């Protein structure tokens, strides 16, 4: 009830939209924009492989951070965080990511609640996601200030390289990442760990 203020921006993966083991030695942190054209191939062909090869093995933690840089994306950005927080008790990144993926693979005035609500249907949650609640949360623009933290966070992280998709493996920064690039960097990280 009465506690100190929350951090402006968290210090551990546990408190970011993350799947896998939060204590894991390696952390993959990905930044994506709801409208980025280069992210469609990534979330569809690259992101799952990251999950399968490094996250499902307990080798890495996978964080996905949303950002809003081009007009028409804020509604979708709102919906993402609206779904991420569909349950007051527990944030479920699993629903939030699958929702994201569905948005990235969707074909400038595109982001409408109806389209955002339809994509949100049948979404797997740990006690279900309602359209009317989702539409209300989008119009409310609850998470405008949050997305500003994300933009500034991802910016300061990339030294201004505000382009997506951008994945961060350990302390390494890979623009327009591929699976080979990500794997090649992990091979180095496993090697340094071995040292």
Residue numbers in the entry: 3 to 109, 114 to 132, 135 to 203
Quote what the paper states about this structure:
Disulfide bond proteins (DSB) are thiol-disulfide oxidoreductases found in the periplasm of Gram negative bacteria which catalyse the oxidative folding of disulfide bond containing substrate proteins. Here we investigated the DsbA enzyme from Chlamydia trachomatis, responsible for human urogenital chlamydia infections. In the present study we confirm that CtDsbA has oxidizing enzymatic activity and a structure similar to that of other DsbA-II type proteins that contain a second non-catalytic disulfide bond. We find that CtDsbA has a particularly weak oxidizing potential for a DsbA enzyme, which appears to stem in part from its uncommon active site dipeptide motif of two uncharged amino acids.
We solved the crystal structure of CtDsbA, which was determined to 2.7 Å resolution by using molecular replacement methods. Consistent with all structurally characterized DsbA proteins, CtDsbA comprises a thioredoxin domain into which a second helical domain is inserted. In the thioredoxin domain of CtDsbA, β1 hydrogen bonds to β3 to give a β-sheet topology of 1-3-2-4-5, assigning CtDsbA to the DsbA-II enzyme class. In CtDsbA, the active site motif is Cys-Ser-Ala-Cys. CtDsbA’s dipeptide sequence is notable in that it lacks a Pro at X1 and has a non-polar aliphatic residue (Ala) at X2. In the crystal structure Cys38 and Cys41 are oxidized, with a disulfide bond length of 2.03 Å. Notably CtDsbA has a second disulfide bridge formed between Cys 84 (H2) and Cys 145 (H5) stapling this helical bundle. Notably L1 contains an unpaired cysteine residue, which to our knowledge is the first structural report of an unpaired cysteine in a surface loop adjacent to the active site in DsbA. In CtDsbA, Cys 70 is positioned at the C-terminus of the B3 strand, and directed towards Ser 75 and Met 76 of the adjacent H2; as the side chain of Cys 70 is relatively buried in comparison to Cys 38 it is unlikely to play a role in interaction with substrate or redox partner proteins unless this loop undergoes a significant conformational change during the catalytic cycle. CtDsbA is strikingly charged near its active site with a pronounced patch of negative potential in this region.
